[PDB]
Design a protein around this nucleic acid. Structure first.
Length: 178
RNA sequence: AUGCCGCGGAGCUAUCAUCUGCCGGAUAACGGCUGAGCCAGAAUCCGUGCCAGAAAGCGACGAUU
């Protein structure tokens, strides 16, 4: 269509400036700088409302408008309240040992399924790890927190064994805000 | 036409002797993340490394009858 628009109201967040389509959203919790060069959308800021508009876009290009609205709300939620993931360890026989170094940006996993190899993972920037067998992933970027959970889950994978019997692994339990 | 036999240094030489022979990045299959853009990811791929050095690619330097 010629005009497809979505409207969002901005919260009390400090700066939402969009220089070079790059949203440098700074709020009470922190700063999240992300690019919107992947979408060709006129989003206009006036007063306390922002309008995402696409002109002459087809169905494929018009589908990304709601995705932009979803993500723009996402780091608004991140810079206001933040994102926290609670992730519980499941093991049958061998307890899983987890160590956090330099305030949790590196997580070391040992004794997974009885293996002697130490699995060390570097979390994405802006995410910190804490021990509540519960792991808490808190940060500003939902992108980085979810990715860090994905990396941990993929790293603690069972190989060449029957999943039907071996239910060991690490799966996310709760995804909420601080 | 080195007569033969034993041992024979030196040199040559032997998977007949000894020594030496890695970690980065980007990916496929494939699985995730958010919902395209990223992530994880192979003996694959490109580099590090190793060989040659363009005899018409180049630099610094020395002395200049």
């Amino acid at each position: 269509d010629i005009y497809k628009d979505e409207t969002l109201t901005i919260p009390k967040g400090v700066t939402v400036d969009i220089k070079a389509r790059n949203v440098t959203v700074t709020g009470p919790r922190g700063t999240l700088k992300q690019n919107l060069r992947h979408v060709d959308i006129e989003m206009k800021k006036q007063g306390n409302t922002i309008k995402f508009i696409v002109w002459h876009g087809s169905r494929k290009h018009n589908a990304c408008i709601r995705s932009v609205y979803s993500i723009i709300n996402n780091m608004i939620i991140g810079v206001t309240q933040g994102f926290r993931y609670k992730m519980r360890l499941v093991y049958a026989h061998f307890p899983i040992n987890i160590n956090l170094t330099e305030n949790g940006t590196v997580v070391e996993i040992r004794n997974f399924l009885g293996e002697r190899i130490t699995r060390v993972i570097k979390c994405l920037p802006g995410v910190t790890v804490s021990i509540s067998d519960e792991i808490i992933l808190e940060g500003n970027s939902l992108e980085n927190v979810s990715q860090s959970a994905a990396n941990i889950k993929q790293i603690c994978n069972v190989r060449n064994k029957d999943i039907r019997k071996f239910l060991d692994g690490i799966y996310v339990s709760e995804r909420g805000n601080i």
